[PDB]
């Protein structure tokens, strides 16, 4: 059966590509995925990682965790109730999450059913040849063939997978995938990694932990959230500690063993040990390239393991493309969507378009959260002669009342001081992810720091702090930090 | 004999506008400044004080009281996410809220008092300022112009920044009603309250009273016209009406109190023009705010008022008297803190900085702290449709996923973008939902940079957020062509 486009992976990127090809350009599209709905055994499914074991369920679980702060903080505003009666039912959270995600799974299934030139196939897709995608029962290339899809065009969009370090007892550890389906909230949990997944789950586990519970986050280096603003990395560390999460920096598991009670004994490279109910490895995500049989057609990988692509998502093989996490670039849903749309406009429209990977807004659903767009000051300082940093920092008046006085709002703007051009905006505090979206738009209009400070504020908000910073706090000259210009 | 003091600038009103002007004049340009206000700290008898209406009896305390009110929703919405506690034990303690708000406001009052005691060429004078002549401001003990003179301040330049005051309708029993001013000091939360008005102050207080009412309590909002929140997007007006109703607030539209008497039990018996009646414990009038011009004795120097009652100003805040200026609510235009601040800063840069500058009153971001709130910047579609031959409206609306779990399914998110369809210029952005006031701030920057719809949709979304809806709208929902609403272009 003959298709213009075969997409392997019904995920953020694959679905955007497929939808657009069918509905905008009247093409015949086949999309393959390994499951129709979320969860064990394969976790991702129709909708992708984001829908099934990613942005969507984690956001709903962070919403859940936020109530731990809201219930306590309400007292300062005169709310009275029996604090001793308060309990966090993990099972109810997971059932509510499960229902929300399943509803999205069914809605996407109806999308395929109701849309011309857009067909779903269940199974494991791989490259037989330049123009043939084979769908099998399992990831085993020896398993029963279900379909052979002849394709003018093949889109690789299989996403990424949790990286598990090669330490003794790694089989006793879980990933984010299993975290979504834990029957019980872990009493003691170690989250391994300093990235957004580790931090976000440390917050989820911290709110739902049974009495006497303890969330520990470890990270092999000095400071969590490498690649984020340094002030914010230091402040989110403080804010996680203030909420009872134990941060172990410069620590890395060397091995994990089974205790007689079913708990885990973690030995660090330092020789420290910790007993936990759960060890969640969140050290990274690697391109999902192994099941695709890329060596059947010679699709080239980078040394890092990504499918190598040019700016238009083309592989070394004509009519084979790769978008989203499999290209091991920015591992974000909206980037995967943008690449898919760009690809389909390039190949099927008269409109060659390439995704802009600069000035992409992103968020960490820490409590409170991070919103960021564009360069951090140390990356700016290597690119530009004169960088100005503007910094506003304060305890929200509401947290003087709530008692959460540790909850510092941070707003930083990084400029090219030569012309005023905003290079980066970095926010920590309630609403930060919401504030930053339209900042993303501002950086596409070559917004200068004067464009922010000449805009009239919305009062009272956190966001108005962006329109109130007129004088640099400090500068980088030829890459060196200093309070005054040299 | 006590001598008058001489200043480059005398500001009447230590509020949002006046303090910005005063600070900038003294600290940026080395001018000698006097600022006059009637009270050093918030509350009765004059309510506004050092810091202005926003600090004392406006934005600051209302926002802290709305934050308090939001916990009614959080406590209930927590259960869907697995939170369990004794619902029967839940009590909203208004006295705690009011005491917390009072200490937050007093701390701002004290810090402003300190700025004044500490900053050279920036002096605070306690009392009632009025114009005696072109170059003399008199500070009196009261608003009565026969009250004792405390100071005469000679001024090269005079700034009128005395703000506004609640409007009270001339109805029988008006003395049985309060304004927002008294609302902030009620010793007890009212069991039954009528908020009169369809504006943001009525809507915002309705939400506050609704969360803190005792058992059996009821909040009623009345408005003389068909739909609350004139000036806001019509979809949002309709939806915030449904969301107030869904949270147990009674909305009486096309209804207006004709009189108020006291029942024998001391409760308020309200009779509407329709002959409908309602018994409440509190009637809060929030029908408008009027410029505070009466006490300035403007007739002494001939400062012209508009028909409407505001001080008349040109684009540079200049009155008809060359060295007398007016900014903020006294000009009776956009009654917003950050617009008063912008005007004050522009005035001082123009008068003392020799870099002339006028406030842009277009594309001003603003919010309503309804639950959930409104964030808006720029033109509503029916206004755009009168100025532009071809208007496109982009619209996203849905029940946030989190509210399918919370149970608050009535909490529909609305994002609307209004464009000149001719060139794609964004005229207006209108948001209803959690974070809308935070979202809209940088949208203000976008409109100042003449953003087009394609600037929005080429921007990559932050996922998952409400705000990414602004960046996923590629096709108009409908149009206006020569003022006519239609789903498709001809
Ligand atoms: C815990 C977690 C939280 C995240 N939070 C966020 C967030 O808040 N915001 C954000 O922007 N991003 C977030 N991400 C990242 C985001 O999920 C990914 O960047 C995005 O899903 C990648 O889209 P994609 O199209 O590359 O692939 P995916 O969405 O991963 O889709 C790949 C699909 O391919 C299927 N598949 C794999 N191999 C085969 C095969 N051989 N044949 C058929 N089908 C196959 C899989 O089942 C899967 O459905 C998160 C990720 C995780 C793990
Ligand atoms: C309930 C409420 C909620 C509000 N919420 C918001 C909001 O969320 N966001 C927002 O932007 N705006 C809000 N506002 C509006 C905001 O408060 C005003 O727009 C702003 O304060 C006006 O600034 P101003 O400089 O014109 O005057 P003000 O800030 O009102 O200052 C005027 C000052 O003059 C003093 N004064 C008056 N007469 C004399 C005299 N003769 N001599 C000496 N001193 C005198 C007064 O005591 C007062 O302190 C709210 C207003 C109210 C009432
Ligand atoms: C300015 N000032 C003064 C001093 C000096 C001067 C004067 C005049 C002019 C100029 C200068 C003021 C301001 N600032 C700050 O800090 N600031 C900042 C901050 C802090 C905290 C905060 C918060 O929370 N935010 C969020 C939002 C909101 C607000 C409020 C409320 F109630 C709720 C919510 O925020 C402020 C203050 C106060 C207010 F009311 C607001 C804001 C600074 C200082
Ligand atoms: C694009 N898409 C895809 C395709 C599909 C289809 C089509 C057609 C037919 C059928 C199917 C996606 C998007 N959309 C919508 O709507 N949307 C919109 C909405 C709804 C709801 C919401 C919310 O809540 N928001 C806020 C933020 C968030 C999110 C999520 C979560 F969990 C949290 C938070 O948001 C969506 C859905 C889902 C998701 F996950 C997200 C979002 C659309 C669609």
PDB file of N, CA, C and O in Angstrom, chain B residues 156-201:
ATOM      1  N   UNK B 156       8.375  76.952  41.291  1.00  0.00           N
ATOM      2  CA  UNK B 156       8.500  77.283  39.848  1.00  0.00           C
ATOM      3  C   UNK B 156       7.508  76.437  39.047  1.00  0.00           C
ATOM      4  O   UNK B 156       6.939  76.949  38.092  1.00  0.00           O
ATOM      5  N   UNK B 157       7.321  75.181  39.442  1.00  0.00           N
ATOM      6  CA  UNK B 157       6.496  74.191  38.717  1.00  0.00           C
ATOM      7  C   UNK B 157       5.568  73.497  39.703  1.00  0.00           C
ATOM      8  O   UNK B 157       6.037  73.130  40.800  1.00  0.00           O
ATOM      9  N   UNK B 158       4.307  73.305  39.320  1.00  0.00           N
ATOM     10  CA  UNK B 158       3.311  72.667  40.220  1.00  0.00           C
ATOM     11  C   UNK B 158       2.738  71.462  39.500  1.00  0.00           C
ATOM     12  O   UNK B 158       2.317  71.620  38.331  1.00  0.00           O
ATOM     13  N   UNK B 159       2.760  70.319  40.185  1.00  0.00           N
ATOM     14  CA  UNK B 159       2.167  69.062  39.685  1.00  0.00           C
ATOM     15  C   UNK B 159       0.929  68.704  40.511  1.00  0.00           C
ATOM     16  O   UNK B 159       1.045  68.509  41.761  1.00  0.00           O
ATOM     17  N   UNK B 160      -0.214  68.636  39.835  1.00  0.00           N
ATOM     18  CA  UNK B 160      -1.499  68.184  40.421  1.00  0.00           C
ATOM     19  C   UNK B 160      -1.600  66.679  40.198  1.00  0.00           C
ATOM     20  O   UNK B 160      -1.684  66.282  39.031  1.00  0.00           O
ATOM     21  N   UNK B 161      -1.537  65.881  41.265  1.00  0.00           N
ATOM     22  CA  UNK B 161      -1.564  64.398  41.185  1.00  0.00           C
ATOM     23  C   UNK B 161      -2.366  63.822  42.364  1.00  0.00           C
ATOM     24  O   UNK B 161      -1.849  62.943  43.101  1.00  0.00           O
ATOM     25  N   UNK B 162      -3.588  64.337  42.546  1.00  0.00           N
ATOM     26  CA  UNK B 162      -4.451  64.109  43.737  1.00  0.00           C
ATOM     27  C   UNK B 162      -5.386  62.921  43.517  1.00  0.00           C
ATOM     28  O   UNK B 162      -6.158  62.591  44.459  1.00  0.00           O
ATOM     29  N   UNK B 163      -5.350  62.331  42.326  1.00  0.00           N
ATOM     30  CA  UNK B 163      -6.032  61.060  42.017  1.00  0.00           C
ATOM     31  C   UNK B 163      -7.540  61.206  42.014  1.00  0.00           C
ATOM     32  O   UNK B 163      -8.053  62.267  41.590  1.00  0.00           O
ATOM     33  N   UNK B 164      -8.243  60.148  42.409  1.00  0.00           N
ATOM     34  CA  UNK B 164      -9.716  60.066  42.279  1.00  0.00           C
ATOM     35  C   UNK B 164     -10.317  59.612  43.606  1.00  0.00           C
ATOM     36  O   UNK B 164      -9.574  59.338  44.570  1.00  0.00           O
ATOM     37  N   UNK B 165     -11.646  59.526  43.617  1.00  0.00           N
ATOM     38  CA  UNK B 165     -12.487  59.247  44.798  1.00  0.00           C
ATOM     39  C   UNK B 165     -13.727  58.480  44.355  1.00  0.00           C
ATOM     40  O   UNK B 165     -14.212  58.704  43.237  1.00  0.00           O
ATOM     41  N   UNK B 166     -14.274  57.562  45.189  1.00  0.00           N
ATOM     42  CA  UNK B 166     -15.457  56.803  44.803  1.00  0.00           C
ATOM     43  C   UNK B 166     -16.623  57.747  44.479  1.00  0.00           C
ATOM     44  O   UNK B 166     -16.826  58.700  45.179  1.00  0.00           O
ATOM     45  N   UNK B 167     -17.365  57.430  43.438  1.00  0.00           N
ATOM     46  CA  UNK B 167     -18.627  58.124  43.120  1.00  0.00           C
ATOM     47  C   UNK B 167     -19.756  57.477  43.924  1.00  0.00           C
ATOM     48  O   UNK B 167     -19.828  56.255  43.934  1.00  0.00           O
ATOM     49  N   UNK B 168     -20.552  58.271  44.629  1.00  0.00           N
ATOM     50  CA  UNK B 168     -21.736  57.784  45.377  1.00  0.00           C
ATOM     51  C   UNK B 168     -22.974  58.377  44.710  1.00  0.00           C
ATOM     52  O   UNK B 168     -23.057  59.593  44.546  1.00  0.00           O
ATOM     53  N   UNK B 169     -23.951  57.557  44.262  1.00  0.00           N
ATOM     54  CA  UNK B 169     -25.145  58.080  43.609  1.00  0.00           C
ATOM     55  C   UNK B 169     -26.033  58.781  44.650  1.00  0.00           C
ATOM     56  O   UNK B 169     -26.036  58.385  45.812  1.00  0.00           O
ATOM     57  N   UNK B 170     -26.768  59.800  44.213  1.00  0.00           N
ATOM     58  CA  UNK B 170     -27.669  60.594  45.079  1.00  0.00           C
ATOM     59  C   UNK B 170     -28.969  59.815  45.195  1.00  0.00           C
ATOM     60  O   UNK B 170     -29.885  60.155  44.434  1.00  0.00           O
ATOM     61  N   UNK B 171     -28.997  58.755  46.012  1.00  0.00           N
ATOM     62  CA  UNK B 171     -30.235  57.952  46.238  1.00  0.00           C
ATOM     63  C   UNK B 171     -30.604  58.066  47.713  1.00  0.00           C
ATOM     64  O   UNK B 171     -29.741  58.231  48.577  1.00  0.00           O
ATOM     65  N   UNK B 172     -31.913  58.005  48.037  1.00  0.00           N
ATOM     66  CA  UNK B 172     -32.343  57.949  49.430  1.00  0.00           C
ATOM     67  C   UNK B 172     -31.640  56.770  50.115  1.00  0.00           C
ATOM     68  O   UNK B 172     -31.667  55.642  49.568  1.00  0.00           O
ATOM     69  N   UNK B 173     -31.009  57.047  51.261  1.00  0.00           N
ATOM     70  CA  UNK B 173     -30.325  56.028  52.078  1.00  0.00           C
ATOM     71  C   UNK B 173     -28.900  55.747  51.610  1.00  0.00           C
ATOM     72  O   UNK B 173     -28.320  54.722  52.058  1.00  0.00           O
ATOM     73  N   UNK B 174     -28.331  56.620  50.771  1.00  0.00           N
ATOM     74  CA  UNK B 174     -26.908  56.507  50.315  1.00  0.00           C
ATOM     75  C   UNK B 174     -25.993  56.428  51.546  1.00  0.00           C
ATOM     76  O   UNK B 174     -24.973  55.748  51.486  1.00  0.00           O
ATOM     77  N   UNK B 175     -26.345  57.095  52.637  1.00  0.00           N
ATOM     78  CA  UNK B 175     -25.557  57.051  53.895  1.00  0.00           C
ATOM     79  C   UNK B 175     -25.544  55.633  54.496  1.00  0.00           C
ATOM     80  O   UNK B 175     -24.750  55.419  55.409  1.00  0.00           O
ATOM     81  N   UNK B 176     -26.384  54.696  54.053  1.00  0.00           N
ATOM     82  CA  UNK B 176     -26.372  53.296  54.554  1.00  0.00           C
ATOM     83  C   UNK B 176     -25.428  52.430  53.711  1.00  0.00           C
ATOM     84  O   UNK B 176     -25.359  51.216  53.955  1.00  0.00           O
ATOM     85  N   UNK B 177     -24.761  53.015  52.725  1.00  0.00           N
ATOM     86  CA  UNK B 177     -23.868  52.287  51.784  1.00  0.00           C
ATOM     87  C   UNK B 177     -22.414  52.678  52.041  1.00  0.00           C
ATOM     88  O   UNK B 177     -22.166  53.740  52.594  1.00  0.00           O
ATOM     89  N   UNK B 178     -21.482  51.835  51.620  1.00  0.00           N
ATOM     90  CA  UNK B 178     -20.016  52.106  51.689  1.00  0.00           C
ATOM     91  C   UNK B 178     -19.447  52.129  50.266  1.00  0.00           C
ATOM     92  O   UNK B 178     -20.180  51.847  49.310  1.00  0.00           O
ATOM     93  N   UNK B 179     -18.164  52.443  50.157  1.00  0.00           N
ATOM     94  CA  UNK B 179     -17.345  52.363  48.928  1.00  0.00           C
ATOM     95  C   UNK B 179     -16.247  51.334  49.149  1.00  0.00           C
ATOM     96  O   UNK B 179     -16.142  50.800  50.272  1.00  0.00           O
ATOM     97  N   UNK B 180     -15.386  51.118  48.154  1.00  0.00           N
ATOM     98  CA  UNK B 180     -14.186  50.245  48.286  1.00  0.00           C
ATOM     99  C   UNK B 180     -13.362  50.642  49.521  1.00  0.00           C
ATOM    100  O   UNK B 180     -12.835  49.747  50.172  1.00  0.00           O
ATOM    101  N   UNK B 181     -13.305  51.938  49.862  1.00  0.00           N
ATOM    102  CA  UNK B 181     -12.478  52.488  50.959  1.00  0.00           C
ATOM    103  C   UNK B 181     -12.806  51.779  52.271  1.00  0.00           C
ATOM    104  O   UNK B 181     -11.880  51.327  52.949  1.00  0.00           O
ATOM    105  N   UNK B 182     -14.082  51.752  52.646  1.00  0.00           N
ATOM    106  CA  UNK B 182     -14.570  51.128  53.903  1.00  0.00           C
ATOM    107  C   UNK B 182     -14.489  49.594  53.804  1.00  0.00           C
ATOM    108  O   UNK B 182     -14.227  48.944  54.833  1.00  0.00           O
ATOM    109  N   UNK B 183     -14.660  49.039  52.612  1.00  0.00           N
ATOM    110  CA  UNK B 183     -14.605  47.577  52.344  1.00  0.00           C
ATOM    111  C   UNK B 183     -13.313  47.001  52.917  1.00  0.00           C
ATOM    112  O   UNK B 183     -13.362  45.919  53.501  1.00  0.00           O
ATOM    113  N   UNK B 184     -12.211  47.744  52.800  1.00  0.00           N
ATOM    114  CA  UNK B 184     -10.842  47.318  53.181  1.00  0.00           C
ATOM    115  C   UNK B 184     -10.690  47.252  54.697  1.00  0.00           C
ATOM    116  O   UNK B 184      -9.679  46.670  55.156  1.00  0.00           O
ATOM    117  N   UNK B 185     -11.647  47.815  55.450  1.00  0.00           N
ATOM    118  CA  UNK B 185     -11.567  47.907  56.933  1.00  0.00           C
ATOM    119  C   UNK B 185     -12.782  47.268  57.600  1.00  0.00           C
ATOM    120  O   UNK B 185     -12.877  47.344  58.803  1.00  0.00           O
ATOM    121  N   UNK B 186     -13.675  46.623  56.869  1.00  0.00           N
ATOM    122  CA  UNK B 186     -14.827  45.951  57.514  1.00  0.00           C
ATOM    123  C   UNK B 186     -14.310  45.064  58.644  1.00  0.00           C
ATOM    124  O   UNK B 186     -13.355  44.312  58.468  1.00  0.00           O
ATOM    125  N   UNK B 187     -14.831  45.202  59.881  1.00  0.00           N
ATOM    126  CA  UNK B 187     -14.339  44.401  61.006  1.00  0.00           C
ATOM    127  C   UNK B 187     -14.692  42.909  60.867  1.00  0.00           C
ATOM    128  O   UNK B 187     -13.973  42.090  61.376  1.00  0.00           O
ATOM    129  N   UNK B 188     -15.806  42.615  60.203  1.00  0.00           N
ATOM    130  CA  UNK B 188     -16.356  41.260  59.980  1.00  0.00           C
ATOM    131  C   UNK B 188     -16.616  41.112  58.490  1.00  0.00           C
ATOM    132  O   UNK B 188     -17.010  42.080  57.847  1.00  0.00           O
ATOM    133  N   UNK B 189     -16.507  39.892  57.920  1.00  0.00           N
ATOM    134  CA  UNK B 189     -16.885  39.675  56.525  1.00  0.00           C
ATOM    135  C   UNK B 189     -18.407  39.670  56.476  1.00  0.00           C
ATOM    136  O   UNK B 189     -19.035  39.069  57.325  1.00  0.00           O
ATOM    137  N   UNK B 190     -19.062  40.366  55.527  1.00  0.00           N
ATOM    138  CA  UNK B 190     -20.518  40.392  55.476  1.00  0.00           C
ATOM    139  C   UNK B 190     -21.104  39.044  55.048  1.00  0.00           C
ATOM    140  O   UNK B 190     -20.548  38.392  54.159  1.00  0.00           O
ATOM    141  N   UNK B 191     -22.221  38.681  55.681  1.00  0.00           N
ATOM    142  CA  UNK B 191     -22.967  37.447  55.360  1.00  0.00           C
ATOM    143  C   UNK B 191     -23.617  37.665  53.987  1.00  0.00           C
ATOM    144  O   UNK B 191     -23.422  36.828  53.086  1.00  0.00           O
ATOM    145  N   UNK B 192     -24.333  38.775  53.829  1.00  0.00           N
ATOM    146  CA  UNK B 192     -24.965  39.156  52.551  1.00  0.00           C
ATOM    147  C   UNK B 192     -24.427  40.530  52.160  1.00  0.00           C
ATOM    148  O   UNK B 192     -24.411  41.470  53.002  1.00  0.00           O
ATOM    149  N   UNK B 193     -23.909  40.624  50.948  1.00  0.00           N
ATOM    150  CA  UNK B 193     -23.360  41.892  50.420  1.00  0.00           C
ATOM    151  C   UNK B 193     -23.917  42.063  49.011  1.00  0.00           C
ATOM    152  O   UNK B 193     -24.022  41.053  48.296  1.00  0.00           O
ATOM    153  N   UNK B 194     -24.297  43.294  48.674  1.00  0.00           N
ATOM    154  CA  UNK B 194     -24.593  43.762  47.304  1.00  0.00           C
ATOM    155  C   UNK B 194     -23.425  44.628  46.839  1.00  0.00           C
ATOM    156  O   UNK B 194     -23.170  45.670  47.507  1.00  0.00           O
ATOM    157  N   UNK B 195     -22.677  44.207  45.811  1.00  0.00           N
ATOM    158  CA  UNK B 195     -21.700  45.111  45.153  1.00  0.00           C
ATOM    159  C   UNK B 195     -22.419  45.707  43.938  1.00  0.00           C
ATOM    160  O   UNK B 195     -22.960  44.955  43.136  1.00  0.00           O
ATOM    161  N   UNK B 196     -22.462  47.024  43.880  1.00  0.00           N
ATOM    162  CA  UNK B 196     -23.185  47.803  42.852  1.00  0.00           C
ATOM    163  C   UNK B 196     -22.135  48.314  41.894  1.00  0.00           C
ATOM    164  O   UNK B 196     -21.293  49.115  42.349  1.00  0.00           O
ATOM    165  N   UNK B 197     -22.223  47.881  40.637  1.00  0.00           N
ATOM    166  CA  UNK B 197     -21.279  48.247  39.564  1.00  0.00           C
ATOM    167  C   UNK B 197     -20.887  47.039  38.753  1.00  0.00           C
ATOM    168  O   UNK B 197     -20.895  45.935  39.305  1.00  0.00           O
ATOM    169  N   UNK B 198     -20.564  47.248  37.476  1.00  0.00           N
ATOM    170  CA  UNK B 198     -20.118  46.196  36.547  1.00  0.00           C
ATOM    171  C   UNK B 198     -18.627  46.317  36.242  1.00  0.00           C
ATOM    172  O   UNK B 198     -18.128  45.532  35.434  1.00  0.00           O
ATOM    173  N   UNK B 199     -17.939  47.290  36.834  1.00  0.00           N
ATOM    174  CA  UNK B 199     -16.490  47.485  36.654  1.00  0.00           C
ATOM    175  C   UNK B 199     -15.663  46.505  37.482  1.00  0.00           C
ATOM    176  O   UNK B 199     -16.233  45.703  38.270  1.00  0.00           O
ATOM    177  N   UNK B 200     -14.341  46.575  37.310  1.00  0.00           N
ATOM    178  CA  UNK B 200     -13.345  45.657  37.903  1.00  0.00           C
ATOM    179  C   UNK B 200     -13.394  45.723  39.435  1.00  0.00           C
ATOM    180  O   UNK B 200     -13.172  44.691  40.082  1.00  0.00           O
ATOM    181  N   UNK B 201     -13.643  46.899  40.011  1.00  0.00           N
ATOM    182  CA  UNK B 201     -13.648  47.023  41.496  1.00  0.00           C
ATOM    183  C   UNK B 201     -14.817  46.195  42.041  1.00  0.00           C
ATOM    184  O   UNK B 201     -14.584  45.427  43.002  1.00  0.00           O
TER     185      UNK B 201
END
